[PDB]
Design a protein around this ligand. Structure first.
Ligand SMILES: Nc1c(C(=O)O)ccc(Cl)c1O
Ligand SMILES: Nc1c(C(=O)O)ccc(Cl)c1O
Ligand SMILES: [Fe+2]
Ligand SMILES: [Fe+2]
Ligand SMILES: [Fe+2]
Ligand SMILES: [Fe+2]
Lengths: 174, 174
C-alpha cells in the first residue's frame, strides 16, 4: 500500500502550513512513522544549542535565507543556506541552525535513529569555546522530546556554567 | 570536516548538468560516498523494469512531469509526479519510473543499502500480469551495476519468457 499517501504539490503544502512555519511551532514534519524524517522549517528562529546527529542531514533552502553555525576542524564556522541552496551534512558535525527570516522555508531530510544510536545536544561557552553541557537523547519524537531538554538547560545555572572559565551561558538567547 | 562540501545553488547545478539529464545518461548523483544517495533524474526515458527497493525513496519533481507505474494491492496503478509534487515511497512497493519530458528534473533521495540487504529488479508479463523474471543485486554502484543486469534481460528470450502463459516479454521497450 501507499502507506504515506499519494504525491502532492509541495509549494501549496508549504503555503497551507505557513501558520505553523513561524513561532512558536517553527517546523512541521511532512509524513509520520516513516524512516525518512521529512521536515519543513520556517522562521524566524535563533537558537544556541548545537545538534550532534549520528546520521546525515540533507538541506534544501526553498524560500528565504538561513545559516548553520558549525564546529568544523575545531573552529567556529558558518555555512550559509541561501535561497536555492542544497547541502549534505556529514554525521556528527555540530550544527546550530539560525533562521532569521519570516516566510522562509527549508526542506530538511534525516533518518530515524535506531534504538541505541543517540543524538547529542550541546552548548558551548561564548568566552572560551569550551563545551558547557551535553545531553544525549534517543530521539523518537523531537516535537515533544526536545522542548523539555532545552528548557532544563535554560533553567539551570549549573548546567549553563562553563567548567573551564566559569562563565554562565546566557541560556535561551545568545 | 564538511566531507560533502559547502552548500550550493541547486537550480544552477541542474542547469549545468542538463547535458547529463537526458539520454543516454539520464541521471546524475549529487554527492559521492554518502549514506543519503541524492540523484537528479532527467528525461526522456521509459523503462519496463520494476524496482523493489528494501528502503524508502523520496521524490520531488522539480521540473516537468513524470509518473511511476506501481503494483499496489496486487493491481497495476499509476502515481503521477506532476511538477511540484513530492512523494514518499514505502519499502518494497514495486515501481517503474516513466519520464516522458525532456528538460524534466526530479530529485530522488534514497539510502545506501547495507551489505546483505538486496535490491530487486523485476519484469511482469503484459498478457497475464505474472512475474517473468527477478534479479536481486547488492546495489553499490547503480550507474555501472544496473546496465549489464538490464542488458542481460533484454538479450535472453529465456529470461523474458513468462512462466505462466508463455508470452515473451518485449524486453527494452513496452
Ligand atoms: N535541521 C532541522 C531544523 C533546522 O534546520 O532548523 C529544524 C527542525 C528539524 Cl526536525 C531539523 O532536522
Ligand atoms: N528513482 C530513481 C530514478 C527514477 O525515478 O527514474 C532514476 C535514478 C535513480 Cl538512482 C532513482 O533512484
Ligand atoms: Fe540537525
Ligand atoms: Fe568558558
Ligand atoms: Fe527506485
Ligand atoms: Fe504471462
Amino acid at each position: 500500500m501507499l502507506t504515506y499517501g499519494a504525491p502532492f504539490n509541495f509549494p501549496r503544502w508549504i503555503d497551507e502550513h505557513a501558520h505553523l512555519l513561524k513561532p512558536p511551532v517553527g517546523n512541521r514534519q511532512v509524513w509520520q512513522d516513516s524512516d525518512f524524517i521529512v521536515t519543513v522549517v520556517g522562521g524566524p528562529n535563533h537558537r544556541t544549542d548545537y545538534h550532534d546527529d549520528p546520521l546525515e542531514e540533507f538541506f534544501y533552502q526553498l524560500r528565504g535565507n538561513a545559516y548553520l553555525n558549525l564546529w568544523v576542524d575545531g573552529r567556529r564556522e558558518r555555512a550559509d543556506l541561501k535561497e536555492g541552496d542544497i547541502f549534505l551534512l556529514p554525521p556528527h558535525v555540530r550544527h546550530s541552525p539560525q533562521r532569521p527570516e519570516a516566510g522562509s522555508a527549508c526542506l530538511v531530510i534525516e533518518r530515524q535513529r535506531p534504538a541505541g544510536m543517540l543524538d547529542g545536544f550541546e552548548w558551548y561557552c561564548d568566552a572560551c569555546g569550551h563545551l558547557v553541557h551535553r545531553v544525549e537523547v534517543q530521539l523518537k519524537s523531537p516535537v515533544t522530546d526536545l522542548p523539555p531538554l532545552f528548557e532544563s538547560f535554560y533553567a539551570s545555572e549549573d548546567k549553563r556554567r562553563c567548567p573551564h572559565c566559569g562563565q554562565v551561558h546566557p541560556g535561551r538567547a545568545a
